[PDB]
């Protein structure tokens, strides 16, 4: 009954800020601004943030603090018919650690590779290089940059793989890096939040030291201002386009990461009367703020490339891992004191990742430890078995075709599943549990009910929000493709099973928990729609 609590209030805020400030704060937001009308993109971004993202961010934090249990225990206590939401969501974050962790290992592999005087991705005259290597980025696909060839042909060895069927040799230098990542995640997550809330002081604050000196370094190169122009010069024609509204909606939802049961988990350890509303507004601003700061860090360097290095802007203004692993390191290698900037850049990448992966793992631990007392007792043993499974199957992403394994999980394992889970999460709290019961819960904690704005957003805007994102995400679906390679038809189907394995437990647990409860039909529904609190 007596639940642990944060050693300090900063432990909670830094570990929430940590979970929310990840890699997509640096490798997508700045791109979407350059792509969708510069500073004008801040309007649909800010609106979807205000009506879509923030209301869902606030809702899960208050749910966790109020119900004081992990993901699967809490959703059963809110609407027993929808107890499957907890299982789907703990499975989604279970799959997420089968691939997302490799990006932290990539950053660490580049970190250990940076312990030199001439960074190895500069020139085109190496073993791994091809005749079609060129110094910097181009727009012709057959002719790659030196940093692109270094990543694909030395770090990844992706060229030695003929697709998903051919993973090939296991690259043991990266199995080592993934192990260092999982070891770091362990001795920070095994003693619970007493140690977790302290490790997150380094990992959640270091990106701000790294952003600060890279912002200074970045803003003092020739052509630095030209980059800020591409970043922000407004073109309000974008606002009218329905894509950029769905681009803003999608980015705001993903960057806050609500509904995975990890914000819920962190908040479950709060004191019942903590001002969760204040906390939600503060940490969420710090998240979107960091993305704005980061865009200057990235595009100051981008304009320096275009000005003094002679590259077309659209050839280097990219998103995803391509930006942080080939484009930005290519610019670093041209500036004075290059190996210093690479070191703190890749450490920024890794410390940006550990934070958010702490949350996804904690969501699993807290949800299981709060439903199965067997697990709650033997935790540090249980998370060793968790991270040992993570490492073993993780070896698939350390093989030569390991990027093909990564790409498949990235577009199936969790993307569509989490949108469905959170869609049912919105309807559970607002339409079955009721905004009445929820707003009254918030009043008991923080002293006042949430205004009707938050109530209309939870009840009406958020379902439409999540559908808007999902519809435009399905309109853009095509069978899986990476570069010239097209995935076999069986690999596409297997991706849908991973997407369905989680979501299927909304109705599976429903019909099971429905059939196994006594009474007539209406009796069964009201039994499984009366919350746990209303029965105690």
């Amino acid at each position, epitope marked *: 009954d007596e639940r642990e609590t944060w050693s300090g209030k900063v432990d909670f805020l830094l570990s929430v800020i940590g979970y929310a400030v990840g890699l997509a704060n640096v490798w997508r937001f700045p791109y979407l601004c350059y792509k969708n009308g510069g500073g004008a993109f801040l309007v649909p971004y800010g609106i979807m943030l205000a009506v879509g993202g923030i209301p869902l961010f606030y809702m899960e934090l208050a749910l966790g603090q109020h119900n004081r249990k992990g993901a699967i225990t809490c959703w059963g206590r809110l609407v027993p018919l929808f107890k499957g939401i907890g299982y789907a969501v703990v499975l989604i974050s279970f799959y997420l650690n089968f691939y997302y962790n490799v990006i932290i290992a990539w950053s660490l592999r580049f970190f250990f590779a940076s312990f030199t005087n001439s960074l190895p991705w500069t020139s085109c005259n190496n073993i791994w290089n091809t005749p079609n290597c060129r110094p910097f980025e181009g727009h012709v696909e057959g002719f790659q940059s030196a940093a692109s060839e270094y990543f694909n042909r030395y770090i990844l060895e992706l060229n030695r793989s003929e697709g998903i069927h051919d993973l090939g040799a296991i690259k043991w230098d990266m199995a080592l890096c993934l192990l260092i990542v999982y070891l770091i995640c362990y001795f920070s997550l095994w003693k619970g939040i007493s140690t977790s809330g302290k490790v997150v002081w380094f990992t959640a604050l270091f990106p701000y030291a790294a952003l600060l000196i890279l912002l200074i370094r970045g803003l003092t190169l020739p052509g630095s201002f030209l980059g800020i122009q591409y970043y922000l010069t407004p073109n309000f024609s974008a606002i009218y386009k329905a894509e950029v509204w769905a681009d803003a909606a999608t980015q705001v939802f993903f960057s806050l990461g609500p509904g995975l049961g990890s914000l819920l988990a962190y908040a479950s350890y709060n004191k019942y009367h903590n001002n969760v509303y204040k906390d939600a507004l503060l940490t969420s601003f710090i998240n979107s703020a960091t993305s704005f700061i980061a865009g200057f860090v990235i595009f100051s360097v981008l304009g320096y490339m275009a000005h003094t290095l002679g590259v077309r802007i659209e050839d280097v203004a990219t998103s995803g891992p391509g930006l942080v692993f080939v484009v930005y390191p290519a610019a670093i290698a041209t500036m004075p004191a290059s190996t210093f900037w690479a070191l703190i850049f890749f450490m920024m990448l890794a410390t940006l990742g550990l934070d958010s992966q702490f949350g996804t793992v904690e969501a699993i631990i807290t949800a299981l430890s709060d439903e199965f007392p067997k697990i709650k007792r033997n935790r540090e043993l249980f998370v060793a078995g968790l991270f040992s499974l993570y490492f073993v199957v993780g070896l698939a992403s350390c093989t030569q075709g390991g990027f093909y394994f990564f790409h498949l999980l990235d577009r199936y394992a969790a993307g569509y599943s989490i949108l469905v889970a959170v869609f049912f999460e919105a309807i559970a709290v607002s339409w079955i549990y009721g905004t*009445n*019961r929820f*707003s*009254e819960d918030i*009043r*008991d904690m923080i*002293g*006042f*009910p949430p205004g009707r704005y938050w109530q209309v957003c939870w009840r009406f805007v958020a379902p439409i929000f999540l559908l808007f994102i999902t519809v435009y995400l399905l309109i853009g679906y095509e069978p899986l493709t990476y570069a010239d390679y097209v995935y076999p038809s069986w690999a596409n189907a297997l991706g849908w099973c991973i997407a369905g394995s989680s979501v299927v437990m909304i109705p599976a647990v429903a019909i099971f928990k429905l059939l196994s409860t006594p009474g007539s039909l209406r009796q069964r529904f009201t039994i499984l729609t009366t919350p746990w*609190r*209303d029965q105690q």
Partner: antibody, heavy 119, light 109 residues
Framework: EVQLVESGGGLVKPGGSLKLSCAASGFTFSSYAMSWVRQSPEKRLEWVAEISSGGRYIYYSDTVTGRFTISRDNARNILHLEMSSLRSEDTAMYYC????????????WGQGTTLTVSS | ENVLTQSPAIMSTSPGEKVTMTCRASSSVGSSYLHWYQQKSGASPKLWIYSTSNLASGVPARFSGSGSGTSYSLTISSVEAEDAATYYCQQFSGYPLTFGSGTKLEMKR
């Protein structure tokens, strides 16, 4: 335009039981916590019990817990205070006050109903 | 239980003068949660000041509130006869909710 009217209330023997009622009007009763504040004949105010908007969160004074029961009829818009095992220290005027936001206090007060416990 | 006691208990000032009265808590109260009530003789209390300083609907501007921690105070800039009443402070941060001892404001003559 908000109106709170306290009903019930009278003279009771010690140990007896009485139910007080507050008829609310002029606002949506269903989204406002309510409390009962009593004022002794020596004029000192003492909070008695708070019931939340949906009736799911209830708090009592120590002087009063175990003997009083607070409740709402959010359909008919009436607040209630079932009393039992009454002693003479319960003699006071009983006020029905609306207080939903703790940071803003008690917006409106009824004009009171008077209880006397005596033999 | 958080015991709020006020001083002076009874207090006479002639109209026009400044009037200051204090409310002390046996245990600290957050500024967001301390309120003030005016009760005229034979009538119900009326919410007067909420969250330490904020005047309620219809409260004239001569009234003001200040304080923090365990020491708060109500102040009438220039008093009037219609201000003769009894003023109660109240904390709303901890159950049991408690009202202050009260201060009767009476007119000098």
């Amino acid at each position: 335009e908000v109106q709170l009217v306290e009903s019930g209330g009278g003279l009771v023997k010690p140990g007896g039981s009485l139910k007080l009622s507050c008829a609310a009007s002029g606002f949506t009763f269903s989204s406002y916590a309510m409390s009962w504040v009593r004022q002794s004949p020596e004029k000192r105010l003492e909070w008695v019990a708070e019931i939340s908007s949906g009736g799911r969160y209830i708090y009592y004074s120590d002087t009063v817990t175990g003997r009083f029961t607070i409740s709402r009829d959010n359909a008919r818009n009436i607040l209630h205070l079932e009393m039992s095992s009454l002693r003479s220290e319960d003699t006071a005027m009983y006020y029905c006050a609306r207080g939903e936001v703790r940071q803003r206090g008690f917006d409106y007060w009824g004009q009171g109903t008077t209880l006397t416990v005596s033999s | 239980e958080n015991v709020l006691t006020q001083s002076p208990a009874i207090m006479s000032t002639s109209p026009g003068e400044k009037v200051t009265m204090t409310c002390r808590a046996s245990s600290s109260v957050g500024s967001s949660y301390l309120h003030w009530y005016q009760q005229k003789s034979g009538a119900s209390p009326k919410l007067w000041i909420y969250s330490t300083s904020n005047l309620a609907s219809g409260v004239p501007a001569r009234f003001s509130g200040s304080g923090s921690g365990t020491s708060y105070s109500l102040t009438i800039s220039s008093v009037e006869a219609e201000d003769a009443a009894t003023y109660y402070c109240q904390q709303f941060s901890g159950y049991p909710l408690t009202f202050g001892s009260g201060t009767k404001l009476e007119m000098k003559r």
